[PDB]
């Protein structure tokens with residue numbers, strides 16, 4: 236899965 | 242801290 | 248609300264303690280209470296709100312994915328029942344966050360910095376609803392995420408530099424939305440690439456500290472492009 | 477109870493799903509429901525109960541330690557208040573586990589394997605109460621932990637081999653009790669050392685798989701002795 240900003 | 246069994 | 252009797256300052260103080268203790272459900276409840284006081288959230292306080300709910304919903308999403316995989320493999324009622332339980336809890340958290348944004352964080356966000364932050368959050372929590380949604384409800388939810396993300400993008404491009412970390416994190420997440428939710432991998436690649444390139448071309452304007460802020464999110468854009476191309 | 481309407485088998489199935497999903501509060505609630513059906517817990521099911529509550533109380537203990545350290549450093553009411561909140565929640569979990577043991581897991585534990593397991597748990601959850609207790613309440617709690625541990629030790633030495641993993645984990649935890657709770661580091665060292673040596677001398681009787689079970693806990697005995705001597 237791709238990275239998101241959290 | 243020491244280790245315990247969990 | 249259960250936090251209605253606690254001072255705003257005490258709620259913010261306890262949110263910060265809960266973060267240190269890795270008590271993210273407490274952290275989110277304290278930040279919900281702070282929002283409901285009806286005053287501005289500062290940059291720090293917006294980050295506290297985002298950290299709290301991202302950790303809460305992150306645990307739920309990870310659990311949901313595990314259960315959904317087990318459910319799909321098995322295709323009694325127990326797996327479906329327990330997946331539905333986690334799903335309902337996840338939807339409730341997203342509804343709560345969206346409710347805080349709509350009543351009344353967004354309308355009271357009196358500058359671009361704050362409005363972009365909240366509109367990014369709106370896109371994120373509609374995205375998490377879309378992940379578990381099915382059918383026609385899914386289509387309306389997807390459109391609500393895209394719309395919130397797009398409005399944030401429009402404002403951020405007008406009012407923030409291309410290295411601003413909120414702008415970068417918004418673009419990162421909208422790109423993930425395109426790839427994972429909207430079946431628009433080309434849009435995802437185009438967005439991540441333009442965002443990365445335009446940030447790189449602006450790094451020369453930054454201090455050492457702002458440089459570190461921006462390159463941290465640039466790393467994540469690079470990791471996705473490496474996965475996608 | 478909220479799990480009263482769910483089949484025992486479904487509760488056990490969902491406890492195992494919750495473990496896979498790292499949903500330990502759910503896991504513990506499902507296992508509480510299973511216990512309250514009033515039938516035996518199997519070896520596997522006892523391990524599920526122990527895993528669930530150890531993870532729940534572990535998160536609480538870690539949070540409590542963080543907050544207590546911050547509180548001690550600062551010596552407004554907020555730090556104390558929030559530490560007390562976590563402490564009360566921790567005490568409630570320990571009370572719940574102790575209530576399941578006393579009503580009626582222990583009295584219905586009709587062999588040594590099961591009775592030792594539950595008496596070890598009784599010692600553990602009194603130990604966690606002792607960690608946060610103060611003053612004279614603390615003294616009675618310490619005695620309740622020692623008493624439960626000692627009774628488990630007496631039975632385990634009579635009825636189990638010295639490599640049995642429940643016997644080893646019991647001795648490990650009782651040794652920690654002695655060192656950390658009872659201010660009896662010599663007792664702690666003596667217990668960990670005899671337990672380790674007597675397990676090592678019995679390894680020749682074991683299969684490859686039982687050998688791995690026993691040496692895993694022996695590792696923890698070694699780590700403590702290395703810290704203490």
Ligand SMILES: N=C(N)c1cc(-c2ccccc2)c(CNC(=O)c2ccc3c(c2)CCO3)s1
Nearest residue numbers: 241263266289290291292294295298459460463
């Ligand atoms: N209590 C929190 N979690 C936060 C508080 C603030 C804050 C504090 C004071 C003023 C304005 C904002 C945050 C904003 N800064 C970051 O998010 C951040 C910066 C650099 C960095 C990483 C994250 C990951 C690795 O490198 S986060």
Ligand SMILES: N=C(N)c1cc(-c2ccccc2)c(CNC(=O)c2ccc3c(c2)CCO3)s1
Nearest residue numbers: 290291294411412413416457459460461463464
């Ligand atoms: N205009 C800017 N460039 C910023 C201004 C402030 C600020 C505002 C008021 C008070 C103190 C500081 C920032 C604080 N830092 C963040 O909020 C932040 C958020 C997400 C993130 C990172 C940093 C790095 C990785 O992801 S950044």
Ligand SMILES: N=C(N)c1cc(-c2ccccc2)c(CNC(=O)c2ccc3c(c2)CCO3)s1
Nearest residue numbers: 436437440443444465468469470471472473476
């Ligand atoms: N569909 C696209 N646009 C791409 C197609 C190709 C390609 C074309 C011909 C042969 C092999 C590959 C690309 C090469 N990969 C990158 O250029 C890349 C660029 C910038 C960047 C990162 C990765 C990470 C951070 O910033 S990109």
Ligand SMILES: N=C(N)c1cc(-c2ccccc2)c(CNC(=O)c2ccc3c(c2)CCO3)s1
Nearest residue numbers: 247492495518519520521523524527688689692
């Ligand atoms: N659902 C759970 N968590 C468990 C289920 C069972 C079980 C299953 C079937 C029959 C009887 C018991 C457990 C007992 N086995 C261990 O605890 C154990 C064994 C080896 C080992 C480790 C732990 C750590 C690394 O090496 S644990």
Ligand SMILES: N=C(N)c1cc(-c2ccccc2)c(CNC(=O)c2ccc3c(c2)CCO3)s1
Nearest residue numbers: 519520523640641642645686688689690692693
């Ligand atoms: N008599 C024994 N030696 C055992 C008998 C059984 C059993 C009983 C009924 C059904 C299936 C298996 C065991 C299962 N294994 C554990 O319960 C266990 C618990 C804690 C632990 C480890 C293992 C390794 C590290 O810590 S062990």
Ligand SMILES: N=C(N)c1cc(-c2ccccc2)c(CNC(=O)c2ccc3c(c2)CCO3)s1
Nearest residue numbers: 665666669672673694697698699700701702705
């Ligand atoms: N107070 C005690 N009993 C000890 C005193 C000393 C000592 C004495 C003189 C000089 C230096 C040290 C000990 C040495 N350390 C061990 O023997 C040891 C033994 C078995 C074992 C582990 C560690 C881990 C797993 O199993 S032990």
Ligand SMILES: [Cl-]
Nearest residue numbers: 328329332490
């Ligand atoms: Cl369920």
Ligand SMILES: [Cl-]
Nearest residue numbers: 261557558561
């Ligand atoms: Cl509190």
